[model samples]
Target chain A: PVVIKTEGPAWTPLEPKLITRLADTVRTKGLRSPITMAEVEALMSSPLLPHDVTNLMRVILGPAPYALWMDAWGVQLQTVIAAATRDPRHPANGQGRGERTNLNRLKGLADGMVGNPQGQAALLRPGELVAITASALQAFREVARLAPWADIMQGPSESFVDFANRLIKAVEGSDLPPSARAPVIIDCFRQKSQPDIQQLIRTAPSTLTTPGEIIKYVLDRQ
Target chain B: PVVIKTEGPAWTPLEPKLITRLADTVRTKGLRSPITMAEVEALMSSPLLPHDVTNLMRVILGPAPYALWMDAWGVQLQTVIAAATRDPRHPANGQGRGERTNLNRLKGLADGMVGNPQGQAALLRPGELVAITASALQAFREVARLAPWADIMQGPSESFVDFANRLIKAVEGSDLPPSARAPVIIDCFRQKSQPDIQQLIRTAPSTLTTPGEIIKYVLDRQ
Candidate 1:
C-alpha cells in the first residue's frame, strides 16, 4: 500500500499576473533601499514585465527548493568527508585520495543541480527519471551511513573499506541484541538493491545525475 | 546620481516549455499512493515562474532582502500591540492578554503569507516598494500571532482596555527611552500626515489601498 508523506494539502497553481505586478511595484519603489519612490523611479520605468517580475520575486523569495536541496547535499558531503578523513594517525584506515575525489564528485553534482539548466530541467525531462532516482540515492546514502559496511567489502581497494570494517566490528561487538543486526542488514540490502538505481547513475547526462543515486546505492549496500 | 542595486549577469533561463513538458511527464508517470505525480507536476510545470523566480534569486543573491524586513516589521507590530495593551503581565510586555492578542495577530499574518493565495502572492510579488510594504504588514501580523484567537473580545474586554491604557501611558509618560519614543511619535505623525501615502491608499482599488498607506505613513513617522 502507498503512503503519502506531505505536511500540507496538494500544491496549487499561482496566478502569474499577480506575481508580475508585484515585481513591477518593487522595481518602481526602490523598497530594498531606504530610498524614496522618486529615487526608485529614477532608475526604472513603471510597470514591470515578466522578466522583471520574476527577478524581483526571486529577490524576495530567496532561493528555490532546489537551491536549498543543493545546500543540504553540500553540508552532508562535507560531513562525510570530514568523518572519513578525520584520523591522521591511522592513514591507511582513514579516507585517502579516493574519498576526497568522491567528495569533489558530490560537490560537482550539487553545483550542476543548481547551475546547469538541463540538470535543473530533468525533473520534467522525458525519459529522465534522474530527479527521482537521485532522491532515492540520497535516501540510500543515509542508510549506508547506518549500515555495517565491513561485511560487504570484498577488496581493500574499495573506497569505504575502513569505514565498513569499523561499522561491522561495532555491530558485532556491541551488547545490543542480535535482533538489531537483522534489521540493519535488511535495511542495508533494501537501500542498495532498489530498482532503477544503477540505471539512473549510468544514464546521468550531467554531474547532478550521479551523486544522489550513488549515495543511495552505497547506503543500501552497506 | 542614481545607484543600481543589481545588474544583470543572468543565468540561462530554463525555457517555459520545458517546465510545461515536465508537468506533463508527472501526469503521465502513474501517480500512485505513495508518490503523487500530480503534485510533482504542479511544481515542475512552473518551477521558476517570474514572481517566484525573482524572489528566490533575490533572496539567494542577497540583493533584495526579505527576512530582515519581515522580521523587523513583525517585531515592531508586536511591540506596538504590547505597548497599546500595557499589560506587563503579557508575554510581550507582562500581561497575558496583550501577549495572547499579539500571538493571534502573528498567526493570522502567517496564515496569509504562507497559505492564502492573495497573501502569498503579496509576499512573493516582485518589485521592492510593494513587497516591502506587504512584507511589513505581514510581519506585523505574524509577530502578533493572530491564529489562536477564536473570539476577539469574549474572553476579557477589560484586559485589552487595560493594555491600551498602559500603552498610552507609556508613550506619554516617557517610560520608553528618549531615542525610542521620539522616532515612534515622529513616525506616527509623518504617516498620518503624508500626502502621497494618502493619495496612494485612496487611488488604489486593491486590497492594500487603505492599510498599505496607513502602514507606510505610520512607518515614516516612526
Candidate 2:
C-alpha cells in the first residue's frame, strides 16, 4: 500500500475514514491537488466510500445530472473564479451575502490551502490548494436557492393547446430530462380532460417523445 | 485489417469512401451491428472520415450536444419505436409525414436492413439489422423542424427586470451552453441602455451564472 503525504491541517477536520479514502484515491488514481478533467474522470470511477457516496450527491445541486462531479463543480467554481478575479468596482463585488459574495468566500477558503502553483493556474486560478472533497461542499454552497413549484394544472376554459403550450414551456425550461416530459404533460391536464388525453397517450403506436406530439395527438382527435 | 461480411444491398448506396471507413471502424473497434451504447462511445472516439464526419453532425438534430451519437439517436429513435409499436388506432398514426409518421418511416427503413435478432431486441426492437451509418440518417430524419428565432431585444417600454427575465428565459430554454448565457443577456439590452448594463456586467466580481443574478445587480445599482 502506498502512503502519500498531504497537508495535515487543512484536512484535519475530515473524519479519519474519509481521509483514508482520499489517500486511497490519491494512491490508486495518482490524484493530485489542482485536479484536472482527466484526473476528475479517474476519480469519478474509483470506488466510493459509503460516506463519500453521500458527498458525491451534494456536489451537484443543480437539476441537470452532470455526468461527472467535476463538470458540475466546474460550472459553479468557474463562475466564482470569474467573480473573484474581477475588478473591485464590479457590481458583483457590492454584495455581502448574495451568490457573488458567497463565491468570494469560497475563493478565500481555497486560497488559504496548499498545492502546486502550476496546478492552480491550470485550474484558471492561483489557488490549487483546495481538496476535491471540500471542493464539492464549496461548489455545492454556491448554487442558487431554487424556488420550488406546486404541480401545475390546466385552467378552466383553457384550450388544450394553450395549456399544453404553457406546461411544455415550463417543462422544457426545467432541469427535467427529455424522457420525463411526456408523463408530466399527461399529468397536467384537467380531470375532465384526462380520459381522452390519457387514451390518446396510451393508444399511441409508440411512446410520445415530446409535449408537442402529445398536444398534436389530442388536437387531431378533437 | 480484417474485412467482415455484411448484407450487400442495404448499404449499396453509401459512398465507397464511407463504406471503407465504416469497415475500418468495425475492424479496429470490433463494433457490431444493432448498436449498443458502448459501441456508440467507441464509434464517437474513433477517427472520422471527411464524409462520415459530416454524417455524424446530422445524427443529433437537437440543441443539446449529446456526448455520443448513439445517446442522441436513442432519444429520437426510442421515441419512434414507441410510436411505431403503438396500436394502429393511435392518433400519432393518422399522419403520413408529421414527426410520428416520419419516425414510422425510419422504423420501416431500419426493419428492412439486416443484423442480430438479439442485438435488435437489446436495442428495444426486433430489427437488429440496421447499419450504424444508415442509423444516423434514419435518426436524423425523425427530428422536428425547429422554428428559428430572431434575436430578441428589450422592448422599448420594458423594464430592465422584465426584459432580463424574458431574455434569460429564452436563453435557458436554448441549446446554448452555460458559458454563453451572460454574453447573450448582455447583448439583449437596448443600445442606449447598453453602456450602464455593460459597465455593471464588466465591473462584476465574477461572471454571473444566472439571469436572476444579472437582474439583481442591475436592480442593486438602480
List iRMS for all predictions: 16.8, 14.9
Quantify all predictions' global Cα lDDT against the true fold.
0.33, 0.40
Q: Candidate 2 — which residues are off by over 4 angstroms?
A: A1-117, A121-151, A155-162, A168-184, A189-216, A219-222, B1-141, B145-222
State every prediction's TM-score relative to the real structure: 0.18, 0.25
> What TM-score would you give candidate 2 relative to the actual structure?
0.25
Q: Please give the lDDT score for candidate 1.
A: 0.33
Per-prediction count of colliding residue pairs?
63, 14
Please report the candidate that would top lDDT against the real structure. Answer: 2
Highest DockQ, which number? Answer: 1
Model 2 lDDT per residue over A20-121, tens place: 544443345332221221222223222222124234443322234323443556565566456555744333243333323334233333343223222222
Candidate 1: residue A151 lDDT (0-100)? 45
- Listed in order, the DockQ scores are 0.03, 0.01
Model 1 regions more than 4 Å off? A1-85, A88-222, B1-13, B26-222
